[PDB]
Amino acid sequence: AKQQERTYIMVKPDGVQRGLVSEVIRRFEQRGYKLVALKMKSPDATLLEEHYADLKGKPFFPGLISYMTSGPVVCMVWEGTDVVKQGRRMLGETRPLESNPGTLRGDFCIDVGRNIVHGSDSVESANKEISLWFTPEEICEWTSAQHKWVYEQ
Amino acid sequence: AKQQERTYIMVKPDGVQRGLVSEVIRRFEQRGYKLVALKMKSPDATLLEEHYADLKGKPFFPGLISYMTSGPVVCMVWEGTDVVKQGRRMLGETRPLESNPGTLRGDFCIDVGRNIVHGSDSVESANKEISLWFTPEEICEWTSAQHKWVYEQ
Amino acid sequence: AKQQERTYIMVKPDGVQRGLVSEVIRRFEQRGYKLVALKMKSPDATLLEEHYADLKGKPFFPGLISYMTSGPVVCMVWEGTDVVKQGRRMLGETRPLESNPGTLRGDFCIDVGRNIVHGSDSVESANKEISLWFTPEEICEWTSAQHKWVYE
Amino acid sequence: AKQQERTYIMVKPDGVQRGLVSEVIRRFEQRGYKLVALKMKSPDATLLEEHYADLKGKPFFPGLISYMTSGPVVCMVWEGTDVVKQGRRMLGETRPLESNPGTLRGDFCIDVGRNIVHGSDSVESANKEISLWFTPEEICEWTSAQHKWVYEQGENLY
Amino acid sequence: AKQQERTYIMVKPDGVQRGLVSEVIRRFEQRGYKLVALKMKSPDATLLEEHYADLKGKPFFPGLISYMTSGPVVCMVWEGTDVVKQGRRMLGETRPLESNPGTLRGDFCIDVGRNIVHGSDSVESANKEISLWFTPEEICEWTSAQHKWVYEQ
Amino acid sequence: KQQERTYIMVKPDGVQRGLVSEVIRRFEQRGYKLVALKMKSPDATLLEEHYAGLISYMTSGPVVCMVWEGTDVVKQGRRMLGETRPLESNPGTLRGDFCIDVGRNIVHGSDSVESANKEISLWFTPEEICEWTSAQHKWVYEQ
């Protein structure tokens, strides 16, 4: 069951605009994490408001939703051991100015509000996010040919 | 109307297995072409049989369909001037042994039956393929920040 | 004589805006060619009008000049055997739609009017271009540590 | 203003000799920092002596000046929020043996005396360095097409 | 003398299977370390048991040896100042889940049992490993053209 | 068919210029299988047979010797290296991306299957060939 952990990764509108979709996918793909769902979407405010439900009511919330509807996003689900936490380490710290070289934000970003990508903060949050952005039918079950070389039996 | 041209690009099951999704996307993204639709899918045989309708009744057709259902694929639509023909030039010749270094198949492939990616062969094919794989609601309308720097006025 | 050939390479305002300066430099640097002059510049119209003198009078000319002053450019001189021709090959055809994958234009662009970079079309052209865009004191004389491994 | 902060980055003779000019530029360019000045130069000993003014008197000083005049350098000015501090971070520690993988020095260097690049250590030093290595006429202002995607709305805009 | 320090680096079977030989070499080559010995080998269990002598008796030991003989390895010797310590830092922590982005394991690995590469842990163990895996006749003496630009003399 | 092998060698200039990883990458990423590899300082006698001023350069530093396996690897290998003369080679090839002089063209590749078999047996012993099966075999090749 451990290798079956999943996380939700989203390239934010700035990531798409700046031509960083392939780079975000590369960090996960080259690591041995398995891509099990993927779509480009122009979500409406209602969907984004549920994604960010924990931030409702905060003064910056309306601006956040407006910004998140200003361009398309790329939604992904990745599967593998500890992918939630590893996913977060690969993105960098929330603030690019605190992120290290070698991370996505540390390599490509400057402002916290333009930090190109979102990753689930916990397995529980991942499960919520995955079900919000994808139907079960959109999640593609497959077995990697490199499984026995990425994981110990 | 020439900038509006679109083509259908699909990472085949071998491209997904070999971890080349990011590389295929990169070739288009870095060129200035605009990603307008994207999804991972496990298509059933009926959708693939329509995609490959012109090959129906060829002796290799059954094996092609079985192969194309042997892992997930990544479906994409790219937009920009001459994208059908340029997309094909970037993929390389159909046969990897005839493809030049610098092209996707020339860099990454050996066998014509394991040639990692599909690109529409013509504007007519592209229009058919786009509407076969995607509904209009899955196509994302957006304007790239770099438009005026990729295209002349 | 051969090894001292020089060409003029210029990242155009779209190349700079699209963050392709490092990539243009890499194609030459990794090839073993020697960078002997480099500067970012905002040329005035009078210089651009001399650079494009043969085009003066064409309907698109004023627009070309305004476009070429719309952002800074990166000016370079590269040195090495057959650098003019090899530089043009590495850039790809002038028209990106006719340029092959593996070339700068084949990899990165689409419209001939947004074709990110210029390289001299011949040694004759290079001599003219280098003299127009650089002063002799801006050319840096040096010997590469890999010279004996790049050249026989 | 915050977004207008600038730093001086210089590829040292070893960085040029080892073919690392493009890689140094890439780290800044891909990050959204704006290149506003750039030139290759073979500076006179006196310019370098002024650049390292506060190292005069040190036994290694003559040696440092001779080394820094041993090949051309590439001078740059980069602009963006926190560019001085982020620039240093991207370069890695001064000592390559203390620098982490992913930084320029950690990926490409071994010896502190051959550490390929210099970055201003502070805003004060950066302004001094920019003025020493470039004239105001060499600074080429511009606004990036990607500005609104690299930066959020700036605060206290008049 | 300090510039003459050497370490033993080995791409394990998973690193070879996953196509990561060029990437391991790149990390050392681009840093200015000097490659002085290199070979692909399918070692006998006897050689591996001596390599892993400190682990004899552990319950996983027989399984480790059978794993390490399940595909070829690539053996290397690198030379330069502090290469043992720097080499380990470039590989990352033993555990990929603790390794930082930018390191080999942090970029490409997930399971500690499939952590693609080995590096000597000390000058003492490096000297033992080098003489275990290579004869003196396989070590190539040469001087890099970039020596005076990598090192201050 | 898929068992075809070729001999690729990084010449002393390729090693000196830090291009070993890149030569390996071009073959590795293509799906070709590395079955033999070694760094060596061959003597004049091995070099004279191989080539039956050149011998001096070819002994001026170490080389990296390789055997790659896969369908059409001799011809595809040559294509990936580029034309013998770098000034005739296209961008995307190793010599077209990294070289200028024919006498400093960083790499050698067998020109035919017959030459490859001869070169492999000249530069490697049978015991140095490592046979294995790639986990990606069924995705690189059609059954």
Author numbering:
A (entry chain F), B (entry chain B), E (entry chain E): 3 to 155
C (entry chain A): 3 to 154
D (entry chain G): 3 to 160
F (entry chain C): 4 to 55, 65 to 155
What does the study report here?
Nucleotide diphosphate kinase catalyzes the movement of phosphate from a nucleoside triphosphate to a nucleoside diphosphate (e.g., GTP + ADP –> GDP + ATP). In both structures, TgNDK forms a hexamer with an average BSA of ~18,900 Å2. Comparison of TgNDK with known crystal structures of homologs proteins suggests that the TgNDK hexamer is likely a biologically functional assembly. TgNDK adopts an α/β/α sandwich fold with four β strands and eight surrounding α helices. The side chain of Tyr160 is spatially positioned in a nucleotide base-binding pocket of the active site of a symmetry-related molecule (not shown). Crystal structure of TgNDK suggests that the protein forms a hexamer with conserved nucleotide binding sites. Pairwise structural alignment revealed that active site of TgNDK may undergo similar conformational changes as its closest homolog, humanNM23-H2 transcription factor. On the other hand, when the dinucleotide is absent, the active site loop comprising of residues G59-F62 (Tg numbering) is shifted significantly (3–4 Å) between species. Additionally, TgNDK residue K60 is residue R58 in the human ortholog, offering different hydrogen-bond capacities to putative ligands. These observations suggest opportunities for the selective design of TgNDK inhibitors using structure-based molecular modeling techniques.
Toxoplasma gondii is one of the most significant parasites that impacts human health, with estimates that as many as one third to one half of the human population are infected. At the Center for Structural Genomics of Infectious Diseases (CSGID), the first Toxoplasma Structural Genomics Pipeline was established. The enzymes selected from the TDR database as small and tractable for expression and crystallization included: phosphoglycerate mutase II (hereafter referred to as PGM), nucleotide diphosphate kinase (NDK), ribulose phosphate 3-epimerase (RPE), ribose-5-phosphate isomerase (RPI), and ornithine aminotransferase (OAT). The genes encoding these enzymes were cloned, proteins expressed and purified, crystallized, and crystal structures were determined.
